[PDB]
Amino acid sequence: NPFQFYLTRVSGVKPKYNSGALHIKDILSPLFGTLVSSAQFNYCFDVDWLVKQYPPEFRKKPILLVHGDKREAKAHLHAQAKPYENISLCQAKLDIAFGTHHTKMMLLLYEEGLRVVIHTSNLIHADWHQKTQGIWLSPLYPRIADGTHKSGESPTHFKANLISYLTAYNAPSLKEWIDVIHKHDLSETNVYLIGSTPGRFQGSQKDNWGHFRLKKLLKDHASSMSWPVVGQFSSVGSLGADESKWLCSEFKESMLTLGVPLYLIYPSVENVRTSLEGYPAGGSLPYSIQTAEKQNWLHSYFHKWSAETSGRSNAMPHIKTYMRPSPDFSKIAWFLVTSANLSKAAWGALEKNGTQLMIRSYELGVLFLPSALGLDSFKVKQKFATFPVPYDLPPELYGSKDRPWIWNIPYVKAPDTHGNMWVPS
């Protein structure tokens, strides 16, 4: 398996659909390595739940929680952690308004080496229960023979890139993790790292983060040959008064770079209503009426969540993916799993007549490029050499009576899977 791309286990589907799937407990299990220390980067944390996900033997090993919480939220997190002497916190600086620390990553230091996990799940029970989520698992990275001179770098520059990502935090607790990564051999990594970090970026620095980073990698490591762009996410930012302010102008331009139809996949109200969770799935699809009403133009791009190939049409997506399928959707030029949803906050937005890239948030994803494997394209695995696309193709357009799930309005005409209505507030 060259890709090491996995979905999370979903409770309540036929076990066959969970065969190659992972729960966080599987990830932290002793069969993955003898744990010594870990860092957990995320957005939301349920600390009591998280510690229980670690096997009993590892539960007292040091854990660093990297979060973006401030004021009262920060206090509450510290209070969650207090009882556990082995836990430290690292508050990521968020100097730009409306930024979040949205990156989901595990750094897992073992006796036998190091593992990096980049994924899409918050560290709370419900994100790992009945949602479609994605996981990329690094190989076990060995320690560099303490008497030899090697970089431990990969052809995709993953090691240097992960170090620069962590360096942007400017955090003393992460310097230790940076030093740990220096000591390991990451040369077998076959993915590219795509990060977002809060800032306003100029000149050559534009290339470093967000959609400009993606554009840079597609220019340098893909070649060009009507191949659609597919975007799939669980949160939707304010994108502007029309398609030309951002979506089709700078965003699409990066995504269609190589060496044009745009499909966006986002649950309809009907997808949510009939899900395994019912309407409360919508708590994790925070598209607000205030944003939506400003941009009804976007919704003609929307397509339903459908995942029969992975038995997950009823498991609402919290995964975010972007990809470039051929016109018949039988193959792809690339695939990206990331924490970046569809917002300027996550991807970057051009300022000052296009000389400055403004990003609000921390985001992190891995890009699968066929060149990194010696190929020109990946064949799509039609049933979850060939890439495991976790939802159905081609994506199905919204019906005329479909609406995008919008979390802060009520749905009371029809009950959900559990016989409940949704009345937020």
Ligand SMILES: NC[C@@H](O)c1ccc(O)cc1
């Ligand atoms: N802000 C907490 C909750 O609304 C939430 C948290 C994370 C998500 O990805 C979506 C929703």
